[PDB]
Amino acid sequence: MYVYPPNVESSPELPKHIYNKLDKGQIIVVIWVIVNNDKQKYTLKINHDCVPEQVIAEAIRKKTRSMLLSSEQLKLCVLEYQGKYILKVCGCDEYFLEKYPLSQYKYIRSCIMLGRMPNLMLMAKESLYSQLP
Numbered sequence: 101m102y103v104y105p106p107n108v109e110s111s112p113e114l115p116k117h118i119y120n121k122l123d124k125g126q127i128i129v130v131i132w133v134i135v136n137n138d139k140q141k142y143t144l145k146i147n148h149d150c151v152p153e154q155v156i157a158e159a160i161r162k163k164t165r166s167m168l169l170s171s172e173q174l175k176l177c178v179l180e181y182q183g184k185y186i187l188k189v190c191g192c193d194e195y196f197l198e199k200y201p202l203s204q205y206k207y208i209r210s211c212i213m214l215g216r217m218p219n220l221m222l223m224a225k226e227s228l229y230s231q232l233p
């Protein structure tokens with residue numbers, strides 16, 4: 101399947117009416133995973149200008165909390181695993197595959213403007229791969 105380029109606004113600066121809806125610079129996002137095809141979710145508070153791999157890193161921080169990792173161990177774990185996953189907008193064929201502040205992706209900026217909760221699916225990066233012809 102082909103993969104579209106990031107669906108982003110032209111600049112990372114927020115228009116003032118959107119900036120002023122931030123909560124101390126932060127937003128809340130819901131991250132879903134398929135585990136049976138049963139679903140599980142995390143709800144995470146993040147800086148609005150976190151890039152997609154930093155969202156994945158924060159999910160890794162939550163998933164590994166019971167391991168009582170040091171910061172150095174968590175960094176090692178994040179470096180090993182964050183690149184194995186990708187974020188997709190729930191309900192459509194749009195992914196967050198490049199380094200932009202999350203609030204520059206049009207879906208997220210729209211969610212902030214509307215006071216809607218972004219819902220994202222965390223998937224294996226291999227789900228994107230095409231077979232060579």
Ligand SMILES: COCCOc1ccccc1-c1nnc(Nc2ccc(CC(N)=O)cc2F)c2ccsc12
Nearest residue numbers: 131132133134135140141142156159160163185222
């Ligand atoms: C193999 O999992 C798919 C990839 O998952 C991840 C990869 C990177 C960062 C976070 C996760 C991740 N993990 N667990 C999540 N909820 C979850 C909680 C408990 C279980 C059962 C168990 N653990 O006994 C299974 C689960 F799924 C969630 C929810 C949102 S992100 C995420």
Ligand SMILES: [Mg+2]
Nearest residue numbers: 122123124125
């Ligand atoms: Mg404030």
Ligand SMILES: [Mg+2]
Nearest residue numbers: 141142143144
């Ligand atoms: Mg949660």
Ligand SMILES: [Mg+2]
Nearest residue numbers: 189190191221
């Ligand atoms: Mg979906």
